[PDB]
Amino acid sequence: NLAPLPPHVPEHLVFDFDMYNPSNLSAGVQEAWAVLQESNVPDLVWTRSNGGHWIATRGQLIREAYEDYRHFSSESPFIPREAGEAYDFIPTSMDPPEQRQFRALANQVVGMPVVDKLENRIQELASSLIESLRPQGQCNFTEDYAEPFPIRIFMLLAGLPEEDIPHLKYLTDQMTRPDGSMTFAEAKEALYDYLIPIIEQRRQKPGTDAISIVANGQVNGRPITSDEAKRMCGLLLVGGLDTVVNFLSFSMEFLAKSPEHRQELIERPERIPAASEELLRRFSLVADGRILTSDYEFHGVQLKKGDQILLPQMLSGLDERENAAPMHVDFSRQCVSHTTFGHGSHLCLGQHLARREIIVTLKEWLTRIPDFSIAPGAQIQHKSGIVSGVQALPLVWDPATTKAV
Amino acid sequence: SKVVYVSHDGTRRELDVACGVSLMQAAVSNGIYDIVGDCGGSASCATCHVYVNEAFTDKVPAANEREIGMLESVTAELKPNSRLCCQIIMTPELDGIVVDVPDRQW
Numbered sequence: 001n002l003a004p005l006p007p008h009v010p011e012h013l014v015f016d017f018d019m020y021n022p023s024n025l026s027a028g029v030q031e032a033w034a035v036l037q038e039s040n041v042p043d044l045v046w047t048r049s050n051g052g053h054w055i056a057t058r059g060q061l062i063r064e065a066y067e068d069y070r071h072f073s074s075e076s077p078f079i080p081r082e083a084g085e086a087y088d089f090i091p092t093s094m095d096p097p098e099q100r101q102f103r104a105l106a107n108q109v110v111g112m113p114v115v116d117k118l119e120n121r122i123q124e125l126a127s128s129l130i131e132s133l134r135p136q137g138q139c140n141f142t143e144d145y146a147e148p149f150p151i152r153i154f155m156l157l158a159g160l161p162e163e164d165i166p167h168l169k170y171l172t173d174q175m176t177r178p179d180g181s182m183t184f185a186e187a188k189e190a191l192y193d194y195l196i197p198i199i200e201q202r203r204q205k206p207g208t209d210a211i212s213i214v215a216n217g218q219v220n221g222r223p224i225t226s227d228e229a230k231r232m233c234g235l236l237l238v239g240g241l242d243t244v245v246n247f248l249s250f251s252m253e254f255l256a257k258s259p260e261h262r263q264e265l266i267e268r269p270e271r272i273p274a275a276s277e278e279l280l281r282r283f284s285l286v287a288d289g290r291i292l293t294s295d296y297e298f299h300g301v302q303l304k305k306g307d308q309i310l311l312p313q314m315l316s317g318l319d320e321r322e323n324a325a326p327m328h329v330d331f332s333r334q335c336v337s338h339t340t341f342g343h344g345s346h347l348c349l350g351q352h353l354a355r356r357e358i359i360v361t362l363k364e365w366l367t368r369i370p371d372f373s374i375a376p377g378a379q380i381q382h383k384s385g386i387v388s389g390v391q392a393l394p395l396v397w398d399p400a401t402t403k404a405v
Numbered sequence: 406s407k408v409v410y411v412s413h414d415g416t417r418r419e420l421d422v423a424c425g426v427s428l429m430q431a432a433v434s435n436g437i438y439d440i441v442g443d444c445g446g447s448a449s450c451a452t453c454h455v456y457v458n459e460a461f462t463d464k465v466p467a468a469n470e471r472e473i474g475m476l477e478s479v480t481a482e483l484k485p486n487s488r489l490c491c492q493i494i495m496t497p498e499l500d501g502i503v504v505d506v507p508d509r510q511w
């Protein structure tokens with residue numbers, strides 16, 4: 001399933017890689033991508049698959065490209081481009097200076113000050129999920145914890161009723177993990193229709209929740225429209241589900257396979273924040289890209305207007321040019337560099353909320369269930385895409401080894 | 406080493422900042438909210454604006470042309486000692502450096 005080769009592309013840079021089905025995926029999705037980083041692979045390849053696109057395979061180029069939006073535009077940041085159809089969340093596809101307007105507003109609903117005063121409320125949530133899960137000695141972490149936790153946090157900061165959760169879950173599910181029983185465009189529209197009367201109602205009778213703030217904010221020097229507010233509110237929901245769900249699963253998979261790293265955090269919980277950062281580098285998982293605004297020589301390669309380039313957020317921290325022994329998880333690693341939250345003006349708005357969800361999940365899980373492991377006879381499968389993930393995480397443990405608090 | 410953060414209202418915070426850490430990173434990690442650091446430290450947003458005290462402007466590496474470009478769109482008063490503090494990487498020689506944090510970043 002390959003596309004014809006563009007007259008401006010030399011064949012010696014051509015490289016067979018499909019980001020939805022990489023070859024050695026059974027070893028681990030991060031491993032599978034790292035094939036782009038073997039010794040005889042140029043810093044910049046072309047692939048004929050998924051429509052046809054460039055790939056930056058190295059942290060230096062990825063960061064450079066993410067730093068130059070004049071050449072590398074967010075107008076089409078998904079590969080293949082058809083995956084952009086009906087994707088109109090805000091501010092994903094905007095560039096400065098308009099993009100900035102929506103980041104100022106967003107910072108008011110998920111900036112560090114908001115994260116901080118939500119923390120204790122987040123840990124009681126985390127605890128409650130864990131506490132009422134412990135004497136089972138088993139779980140599908142992915143369904144049992146990774147999914148309910150972030151969506152429950154959204155409800156908390158959006159000020160939405162708990163029984164609204166089944167509905168939103170379904171809708172975001174159809175978006176992320178389609179069923180054939182609903183198109184993404186339909187699921188998206190349903191989410192907007194859920195949001196839009198709440199927005200209008202709270203524009204005229206405000207609270208302190210995320211929706212009120214966004215609905216009552218200004219962008220470009222005039223009031224945010226209902227349309228703008230739902231498209232951004234929509235992304236504050238969707239932006240922090242599939243990525244938190246999957247990152248927590250990669251991480252939790254690692255700890256279930258590695259008693260030595262558990263005991264370290266168990267003997268030294270003070271290390272957990274630093275370990276989270278290391279877990280973020282090693283199990284990075286986003287890969288999107290940019291589109292070319294113009295013809296452009298780039299690191300000795302000629303790109304043309306319309307060309308899409310993939311700029312894997314995942315690969316920078318795995319680039320051994322950037323971290324020695326990259327597949328190694330060392331919680332005392334001294335110079336951790338990565339682009340797990342992205343890079344440039346679009347670097348993740350939820351980064352502070354997402355770090356705090358990780359650190360609390362770790363501080364609260366190990367506090368109660370120190371020893372656990374992967375289910376016996378368990379084929380744990382990774383999937384590869386824009387947000388790579390874990391299919392399921394059956395965990396097993398002995399109830400007498402835990403400690404309720 | 407140690408870095409002192411002076412808010413617009415005169416309030417004064419001194420922080421112990423590890424070598425290799427940017428003045429932005431240290432601010433965000435310790436509840437210095439008047440430093441936002443939106444882009445996370447690549448001179449892409451201008452929300453980590455600070456005024457570096459004249460006693461340390463000889464001692465900080467000059468800004469690169471990228472930082473200069475971004476500084477044009479700071480929202481607070483742009484001054485000669487204006488810096489993106491995500492571009493200030495901390496070192497022992499910079500111990501006790503003074504930065505004044507402006508009344509706005511957004």
Ligand code: HEM
Pocket residue numbers: 077090091092093103110235236237239240241243244247285286288289313339340341342343345346347348349350351353354
């Ligand atoms: C470990 C968890 C997460 C990871 C790895 C992650 C990853 C990313 C990345 C790499 C980007 C930049 C995309 C690009 O440049 O094309 C991004 C953008 C964004 N993220 Fe996250 N994310 C996480 C959690 C969250 C959470 C919890 C939220 C909560 C609202 C969130 C909200 C957003 C939003 C609203 C954007 C749009 C940023 C923009 O274009 O200005 N993310 N995310």
Ligand SMILES: *[C@@H]1CC(=O)N(CCCCCCN2C(=O)C[C@H](*)C2=O)C1=O
Pocket residue numbers: 334335336424425496
């Ligand atoms: C951690 C990652 C990084 O790039 N970095 C700065 C590079 C200098 C090498 C460390 C030398 N060093 C010290 O030992 C203290 C201050 C300093 O620059 C890091 O520090």
Ligand code: FES
Pocket residue numbers: 429441442443444445446447448449450451452453475489490491492
């Ligand atoms: S944090 Fe974005 S320019 Fe300093």
Ligand SMILES: [Ca+2]
Pocket residue numbers: 189193
């Ligand atoms: Ca409708």
